[PDB]
């Protein structure tokens, strides 16, 4: 009986592919290939944040564009005052294996997670003087890859046990479970309305979900390898995608298909982090070959090279005002350019 | 141009980084090892004098001049390519092989072939522990080892079978900067901490010689 259902699914996916093909008239070529080039972009080393004694695996910027959170394998979560190259807090972690970190938009909470399958939240503004654990969220059967804050009470985490979950910090329960993504969900990005988010996984799929619902609405496809990074456009209608096949793309929510792809012939290392500028014109992509090169989100052009990392870059971040970019590698030193 | 609050914030930062340096000095003298193997391959009883501290299991004990830490990495059913780079700076990888299970022997061989040629494990040495040798030698009369490993000749003795298994395990090694340490041990063998200590100090000496341009 499953043969008829499989045939119906094959007919539906053939119709979907035909619809994407027929909607792909006046395509990515010669629609954005009519404007001026971005030019030459060179960023000098303004800051070199030091203080970790292990590999930095994550980094998130504050919404004041003043404070950073870097969580590393040494069991330490240092909160950095970037304007003066300064340390504000140092939170000893119970489990040193960490693959993600978050910063609440209010500036009050930071999140952390890793191979302990626990998203542990921390409270910075306390009337005791030190950062304490506020709640330990457990219930996944796999490691957590990326956590992003919606407000002071709701967290959404992407984990490697083929699921994503939205929690509430007060009671520590999974309000919404986002089933799908047969591979391991490896990244997550929030649109600038706290309503819809994207999530890539190892099974080469970039689904789009809704927070107020519990199901997908657009399943982008087209990568031939693993995914590692994802990032929305400032409009809220597009997103980028970094992957293990040295291929960073731009996708389109309205068209339900794939816009221009910025890949290079000589590059073979995987992409670990992608990020967008304030206007969305400049895309910064991390690279596993000890480098982090910039591109253009409209045309294919290597506008510049940001070099200086002794090890692999695993976290890249652009502030809300877009004033500075943070680049963190496994050399225990993370850099801020201009 | 610095204010009073700025000065006291700089002092707080100095205290934070001094405590960070103290913690890094304290934690550098701990040997980190990565236990591996098949299901029920003797990982839970590698050392009978260990204290235990889910995603992964961490167990620690102290022997002579060094403090040991073991990562069982059990229950991590996810893809074994996304969190291996977390365990890239381990000094040694303890692989446990159970000679008793003939069905799961090829699973252990496949795992050994996977981990001994990974990009993150090109330099990390491996301390083999051919566990469960007593009942293996007890059952070596009925089973001649050719039911699971063909293309060999021998007297179906314990020594030759152990040598053949060890040779098959070392045949999956393709690296000029790594040495596999093999040590047959019993389930009643209390002498396991000294084997790991000798192997680990030999590994550290070998790594120091490698880094200086020597062997």
């Amino acid at each position, epitope marked *: 009986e499953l043969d008829q259902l499989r045939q119906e699914a094959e007919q539906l996916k053939n119709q979907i592919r035909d619809a994407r093909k027929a909607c792909a008239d006046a395509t990515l070529s010669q629609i954005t290939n009519n404007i001026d080039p971005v030019g030459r972009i060179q960023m000098r080393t303004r800051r070199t944040l030091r203080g970790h004694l292990a590999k930095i695996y994550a980094m998130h910027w504050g919404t004041d564009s*003043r*404070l950073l959170v870097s969580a590393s394998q040494d069991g330490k979560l240092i909160i950095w*005052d970037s304007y003066t190259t*300064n340390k*504000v*807090h140092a939170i000893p972690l119970r489990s040193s294996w960490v693959m993600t970190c978050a910063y609440a938009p209010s*500036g009050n909470y930071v999140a952390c997670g890793g191979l302990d399958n626990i998203c542990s939240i921390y409270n910075l*503004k306390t*009337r*005791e*003087g*030190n950062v304490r654990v506020s709640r330990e969220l457990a219930g996944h059967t796999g490691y957590l890859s990326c956590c992003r804050f919606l407000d002071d009470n709701q967290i959404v985490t992407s984990s490697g046990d083929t699921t994503c979950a939205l929690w509430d910090i007060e009671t520590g329960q999974q309000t919404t479970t986002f089933t799908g993504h047969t591979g391991d969900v490896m990244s997550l990005s929030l649109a600038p309305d706290t309503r819809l988010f994207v999530s890539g996984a190892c099974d080469a799929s970039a689904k789009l979900w809704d927070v107020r619902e519990g199901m997908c609405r657009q399943t982008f496809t087209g990568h031939e390898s693993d995914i590692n990074a994802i990032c929305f456009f400032p409009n809220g209608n597009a997103f980028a995608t970094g992957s293990d096949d040295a291929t960073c793309r731009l996708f389109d929510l309205r068209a339900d298909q794939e816009l221009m792809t910025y890949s290079h012939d000589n590059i073979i290392c995987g992409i670990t982090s992608v990020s967008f500028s304030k206007s969305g014109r400049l895309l910064l992509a991390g690279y596993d070959d000890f480098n982090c090169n910039v591109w253009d989100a409209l045309k294919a052009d290597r506008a510049g090279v940001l070099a200086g990392h002794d090890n692999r870059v695993s976290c890249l971040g652009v502030t809300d005002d877009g004033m500075a970019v943070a680049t963190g590698s496994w050399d225990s030193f993370l850099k801020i350019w201009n | *141009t610095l*204010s*009073a*609050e*700025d*000065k*006291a*914030a700089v*002092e*707080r930062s100095k*205290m934070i980084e001094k405590n960070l340096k103290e913690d890094g000095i304290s934690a550098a003298k701990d040997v980190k090892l990565l236990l591996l193997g098949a299901d029920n391959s003797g990982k839970s009883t590698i050392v009978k004098q260990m204290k235990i501290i889910t995603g992964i299991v961490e167990t620690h004990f102290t022997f002579k001049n060094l403090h040991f830490r073991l990562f069982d990495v059990g229950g991590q059913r996810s893809e074994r390519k996304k969190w291996i780079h977390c365990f890239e700076d381990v000094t040694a990888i303890i692989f446990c092989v159970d000679l008793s299970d003939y069905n799961r022997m090829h699973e252990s061989l496949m795992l050994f072939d996977s981990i001994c040629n990974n990009k993150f494990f090109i330099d990390t040495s491996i301390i083999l522990f051919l566990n469960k040798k007593d009942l293996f030698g007890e059952k070596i009369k009925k089973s001649p080892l050719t039911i699971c490993f063909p293309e060999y000749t021998g007297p179906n003795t314990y020594e030759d079978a152990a040598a053949y298994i060890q040779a098959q395990f070392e045949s999956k090694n393709r690296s000029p900067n790594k040495e596999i340490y093999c040590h047959m041990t019993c389930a009643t063998d209390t002498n396991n901490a000294q084997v790991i200590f000798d192997a680990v100090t030999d590994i550290i000496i070998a790594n120091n010689l490698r880094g200086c341009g020597l062997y």
Partner: single-chain antibody, 230 residues
Framework: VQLVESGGGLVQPGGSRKLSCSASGFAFSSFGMHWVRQAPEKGLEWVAYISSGSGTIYYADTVKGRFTISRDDPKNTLFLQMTSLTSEDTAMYYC??????????????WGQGTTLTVSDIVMTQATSSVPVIPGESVSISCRSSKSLLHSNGNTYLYWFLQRPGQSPQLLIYRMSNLASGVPDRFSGSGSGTAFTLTISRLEAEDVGVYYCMQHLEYPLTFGAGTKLEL
């Protein structure tokens, strides 16, 4: 979180006393604790200071060479050892906690004082007997000998409310930042050497004396005090 200060009492004009205060509820080593005295019918005055981990110890002009401050971090106790007690030291001695990082709120908790009996920047604020009506717009002013703005973009001026029979409580820090637990009616604004606390819709539990503080140059300067009547 509660600070209890013990000791004090009568002393001969030339003797010595060693006041001590203890904390129970917050991490002591992360806070730079202060000593602030209050004459029985006058304003507040800064006395002593010790940093986190005893890394910096500052004294006042009337405190240098005569007093000393120490803290016992393992036992969570702050010590004030005073020598050559004159008759001008007859004051109630307050223990004040303070933390310093980006976004901190220094001088956010005060301990109940110790009555002692022995038998720069200049700031002068407003009037001292203003007729507060319950429910109004009251603009308590302040002044300074300098424009208290640094290159960091932070203007430093603190507002304290002393209820009758109670220790001072922080209301506004930096220049316009509400402290935690302060209701939204309290609001402050100003510029260099011109500061005003605009209290709108005055209510109960607001009568008392209002104080300023500078925190650019470290020897602390208060104001005389503006008192809300009725």
């Amino acid at each position: 979180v509660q600070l209890v200060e013990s000791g004090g009492g009568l002393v001969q004009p030339g003797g010595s006393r060693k006041l001590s205060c203890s904390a129970s509820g917050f991490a002591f080593s992360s806070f730079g604790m202060h000593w602030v005295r209050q004459a029985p019918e006058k304003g507040l005055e800064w006395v002593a200071y010790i940093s986190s981990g005893s890394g910096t110890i500052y004294y006042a002009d009337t405190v240098k060479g005569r007093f000393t401050i120490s803290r016992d971090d393992p036992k969570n106790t702050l010590f004030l050892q005073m020598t050559s007690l004159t008759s001008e030291d007859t004051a109630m001695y307050y223990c004040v906690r303070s933390i310093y990082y980006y976004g901190s709120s220094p001088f956010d908790f005060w301990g109940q004082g110790t009555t002692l009996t022995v038998s720069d920047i200049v700031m002068t604020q407003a009037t001292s007997s203003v007729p507060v009506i319950p429910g109004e717009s009251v603009s308590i002013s302040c002044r300074s000998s300098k424009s208290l703005l640094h290159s960091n973009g932070n203007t430093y001026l603190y507002w304290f409310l002393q209820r009758p029979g109670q220790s001072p409580q922080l209301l506004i820090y930096r220049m316009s930042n509400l402290a935690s637990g302060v209701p939204d009616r309290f609001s402050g604004s100003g510029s260099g050497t011109a500061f005003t606390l605009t209290i709108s819709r005055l209510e109960a539990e607001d009568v008392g004396v209002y104080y300023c503080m500078q925190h650019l140059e470290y020897p602390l300067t208060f104001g005389a005090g503006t008192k809300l009547e009725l």
